[PDB]
């Protein structure tokens, strides 16, 4: 009841060059602080690597699979192969205390144990087969409808949206 509130960040989403609303995301600093902090810093747009700002502003959701998940966060290569973190390079899986038990959760994408970077996915549905494999670190607390809007975008090969689904702007609440 008197516990400090988790940090909250926002994503202003654009689909096909048209703004479609804001998603407010709570980051679980009280469960996975290191993972939450990595994400928070990339939302500010003020975090710098070698003097150059890196973050989610302008990044794409390169893969949208309705009834499953939406992946994005690759501000490095913009195609799902990019890796970066505030710790420089891939970082360890903090813990798997939280499960992919509902739609709207934020979880870290990876390419195996302890390969977390900047990429993440938002669950469109529960997906327990990812439990213990991906670190859950946040969830949409306002504007879940925007996630549903993204979910319905027409996709092409490998479920890449046919229209740009971008993080037009982001930052902290």
Distance from C-alpha of 169 to C-alpha of 30, rounded to nearest angstrom: 25
Residue 63 is among the residues annotated as catalytic for this protein: yes
Domains of the chain, first to last: 1-173 (2.40.100.10)
Method: X-ray
Token pair 């988790």: residue: 6
**What pairing do the DSSP bridges indicate for beta strands 63-65 and 69-72?**
antiparallel
Here the tokens at position 72 are: 């994005």
At residue 18's C-alpha, the angle toward residues 15 and 24, to 5°, is: 70
Structure tokens at 153: 């975008």
Q: How many Å apart are CA 56 and CA 73, to the nearest integer?
A: 6
Asked whether the CA dihedral 90, 96, 100, 104 is positive or negative, the reply is negative
> Is 75 annotated in the active site?
no
* Residue 130 appears among annotated catalytic residues: yes
End-to-end CA distance of the chain: 21
Is residue 134 among the annotated active site residues?
Answer: yes
Which helix or strand (DSSP H or E) is residue 44 part of?
A: helix 33-44
Identified catalytic residue from 62, 63, 91, 137: 63
Measured CA to CA, the distance from residue 163 to residue 142 in angstroms comes to 24
Catalytic residue (choose from 38, 41, 71, 116) = 71
- 68 part of the active site: yes
């Amino acid at each position: 009841n008197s516990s400090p509130v988790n940090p909250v960040v926002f994503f202003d989403v654009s689909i096909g060059g048209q703004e479609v609303g804001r998603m407010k995301i709570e980051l679980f600093a009280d469960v996975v602080p290191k993972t939450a902090e990595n994400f928070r810093q990339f939302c500010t747009g003020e975090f710098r690597k070698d003097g150059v700002p890196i973050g989610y502003k302008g990044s794409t959701f390169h893969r949208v699979i309705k009834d499953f998940m939406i992946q994005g966060g690759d501000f490095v290569n913009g195609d799902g192969t990019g890796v970066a973190s505030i710790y420089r390079g891939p970082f360890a899986d903090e813990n798997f205390k939280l499960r992919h038990s509902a739609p709207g959760l934020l979880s870290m994408a990876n390419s195996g144990p302890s390969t977390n970077g900047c990429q993440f996915f938002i669950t469109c549905s529960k997906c327990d087969w990812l439990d213990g494999k991906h670190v859950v670190f946040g969830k949409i607390i306002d504007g879940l409808l925007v996630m549903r809007k993204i979910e319905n975008v027409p996709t092409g090969p490998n479920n890449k949206p046919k229209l740009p689904v971008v993080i037009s702007q982001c930052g902290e609440m």
